[PDB]
């Protein structure tokens, strides 16, 4: 775990989707609103700080300038860092989901649904492909982890 991981609300996710392009595979039985990648002109910036008060998810100008405040997550995952990149959806962040994935993860922030596998695994799988950060959201529909 050399990369920041952060939990976001369903609302924050959908706001992020609002700024993404691509439609999800029909195979992920998702909502209409889900999207795959951020448009060229925007990137996301994720800040996890020793002060859990000032965690932030923000959408950024090519200039690093601020476009949209997306959330200030109150929760934390048990690396303190600030990272800026493209955001890429990887569904459950299974190794399988990853290998099927059209858009390459390298150097990008990844967003995944909480789901089939542990958070720990999702982060590792992503980190394994050189993602620079991980967002995790709970859709209401629930997919208990198997062990």
């Amino acid at each position: 775990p050399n990369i920041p991981v952060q939990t976001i609300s369903r609302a924050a996710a959908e706001k992020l989707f609002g700024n993404m392009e691509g439609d999800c595979p029909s195979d992920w039985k998702t909502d209409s609103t889900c999207r795959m990648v951020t448009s060229e002109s925007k990137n996301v910036k994720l800040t996890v700080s020793n002060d859990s008060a000032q965690n932030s998810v923000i959408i950024v100008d090519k200039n690093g300038r601020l476009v949209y405040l997306v959330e200030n997550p109150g929760g934390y995952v048990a690396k303190a860092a600030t990272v800026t990149g493209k955001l890429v959806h990887a569904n459950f962040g299974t190794k399988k989901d990853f290998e099927d994935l059209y858009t390459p993860v390298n150097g990008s922030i990844v967003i995944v649904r909480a789901g089939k596998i542990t958070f720990a695994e999702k982060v590792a799988n992503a980190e394994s492909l050189n993602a620079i950060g991980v967002l995790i959201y709970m859709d209401q529909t629930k997919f208990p982890i198997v062990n």
Partner: protein, 208 residues
Amino acid sequence: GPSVFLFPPKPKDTLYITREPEVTCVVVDVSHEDPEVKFNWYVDGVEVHNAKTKPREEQYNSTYRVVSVLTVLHQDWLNGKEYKCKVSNKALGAPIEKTISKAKGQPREPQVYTLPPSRDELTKNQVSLTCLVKGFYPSDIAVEWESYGTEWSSYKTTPPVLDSDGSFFLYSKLTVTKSEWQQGFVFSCSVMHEALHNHYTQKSLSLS
């Protein structure tokens, strides 16, 4: 004929010792026949040679644009030294002289106040956050809006306006989507001015 425009350094560059401030002598129209431009720089009447001429560059209207940049010392600029740019051309009847300096007066500290959107402005999908910066001298000032340590792209700042007491004021307008305002996020107005302690102050604003 060529036209000459002499510009002052950016406020932050003059205020921060970590930064490098420079005066810019811009030459707007440069003939195709006579492209030659001689630049001569003077500081308080004393000629200096520290300046660099950028490459000449043909514009969209068949006119060369020659720029000469001279780096100034922070306190030389702040004390009110004059920088004279002399442009010499064969296309000029006589060489053109332009002079800039800092306004020489007692510095006055800027008052920074943030205002929230008008109740009538909440009808719209986007709202304006206002930053009033007043009662400062000289005109040299730098204003940024930011949230969570990140500078805002969507904001614009009126030029300084001369007040009745000989001071300046201005406004900065940050435009945000209404929902971002209603959610109770914090916006900050950052102001850099020589009269301020550490040439810096900050005002925050959010939903009550």
